[PDB]
């Protein structure tokens, strides 16, 4: 219903070759999924996992700025790989889905079932709408620079509105011992973190140069701007990550870079197959 038979006919694959290709896909794609889970999860948690773990770290200054900048990195590289090599537009969504799968597994088994923290206190939460819109921008524009601009803007801007339905109810006010707190703050105080005291929270604190009514908005744009840079940089990093050569040697013992080329991609190879 898509155009798969035409693609297979253009590739000149006999039925056994088609079955072998299907087996290659079924073997390699789960491997890529697991690698994305592991590596992207490590990168995200060790760069932005602290705001990710706890409800009271989700603030208006650092969370919506740090999170998208860290998240765009693997997404840009994987999108480069998929789009450039196979014309596949689901890179960023796949990255964020893998990250969320790993995050949910660790929160349920590590934080909750081992450390006895409640599940609602460790919602990560989502970063998916921005990745989806970035994928849609890359597919519709087909240009990676226009994709950098527009998709990075979307990725940096849609983070806070997309997470507001999850963490908005946690901002309801409570009064404890005559002191006003957000419900996330009282959840953080209620469930003791022996290794995490209050003063380590890198959250907003207000300033005499600060417009309290615009804070998130400013954080929504700065995180966007850097994203437009970060994407671009990591897009070039994708070209570094796709570098596939061999160190061959001969005679004097000299080492030369050698590239294995696809024979089907040559000038007259497809016509001579028949």
């Amino acid at each position: 219903i898509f155009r798969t038979e035409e693609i297979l006919k253009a590739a000149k694959m006999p039925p056994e070759a088609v079955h072998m290709s299907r087996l290659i896909d079924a073997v390699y794609f789960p491997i890529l999924i697991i690698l994305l889970v592991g590596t992207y999860h490590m990168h995200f948690m060790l760069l932005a996992g602290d705001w990710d773990f706890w409800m009271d770290w989700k603030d208006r200054q650092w969370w919506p700025v740090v999170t998208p900048i860290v998240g765009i990195t693997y997404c840009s590289a994987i999108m480069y790989y998929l789009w450039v090599n196979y014309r596949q537009p689901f890179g960023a969504t796949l990255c964020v889905v893998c990250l969320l799968i790993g995050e949910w597994l660790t929160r349920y088994w590590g934080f909750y079932w081992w450390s006895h923290y409640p599940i609602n206190f460790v919602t990560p939460g989502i970063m998916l709408p921005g990745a989806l819109m970035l994928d849609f921008t890359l597919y519709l524009t087909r240009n990676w620079l226009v994709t950098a601009l527009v998709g990075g803007g979307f990725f940096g801007l849609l983070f806070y509105p997309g997470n507001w339905p999850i963490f908005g109810p946690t901002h309801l006010p409570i009064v404890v011992e005559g002191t006003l707190l957000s419900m996330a703050d009282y959840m953080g105080h209620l469930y003791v973190r022996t290794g995490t005291p209050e003063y380590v929270r890198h959250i907003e604190q207000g300033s005499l140069r600060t417009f309290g009514g615009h804070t998130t908005v400013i954080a929504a744009f700065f995180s966007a701007f850097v994203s437009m840079l970060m994407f671009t940089v990591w897009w070039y990093l994708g070209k570094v990550y796709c570098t596939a050569f061999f160190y061959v040697k001969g005679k004097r013992g000299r080492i030369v870079h050698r590239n294995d080329v696809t024979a089907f991609g040559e000038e007259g190879f497809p016509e001579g197959i028949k």
Binding site: S21, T39, A77
Partner: protein
Amino acid sequence: YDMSLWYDSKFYKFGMITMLLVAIFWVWYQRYFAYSHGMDSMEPEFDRVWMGLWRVHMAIMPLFALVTWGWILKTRDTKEQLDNLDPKLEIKRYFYYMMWLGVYIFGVYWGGSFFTEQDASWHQVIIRDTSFTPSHVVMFYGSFPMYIVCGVATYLYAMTRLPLFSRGISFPLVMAIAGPLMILPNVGLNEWGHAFWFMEELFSAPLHWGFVVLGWAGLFQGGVAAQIITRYSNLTDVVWNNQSKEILNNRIVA
């Protein structure tokens, strides 16, 4: 047609289930011995339990490396056998190489993702990070070396059974493995930062950024897969499209 001539998956399935069972055993050990014998590092029971597990890891993982690497290097293919290799057997061997990569990546997932947020989870129920904390034993001394062995074994197999890998040096594969490999020595940086003025409170601290830079090397899977797909296309052309074998031996010569 005959599937078995170019595909086999028994070893891959066995490795996957074995790694999953080992991880489940580690999880059960953590959930059974951490609150009762892992709270105090100076207690004799802490020694007998967690340092005993550490010693078990320190004695088993080198044995794992020795056995796997020695078996791979011992049943090697001579240059004669790698020059007249049956292309169907080459497809099967590339499937085997992808499965070795999958086992290595499963080990990396266990080390860097699951048994790392479980550590942050442990970092918040304890006063301060130690060095042989329940968490560390299972990953730092268990999961870390585990994936490293698989990584070496993966490359080993390739550069022993795949002629191309025995010919030139797969640059992307090198980094893909060296990355998580070099992650284990970064435990020194982790400990040095925790024990001294690099602070310990945050899990996303600058001293924890060595792991992300070293794991960025895992993104050379793009080059690894590019090489694999190029060779797979060449093998498909040779075997099924009745094309000349010269495309398999033309571009990786001196």
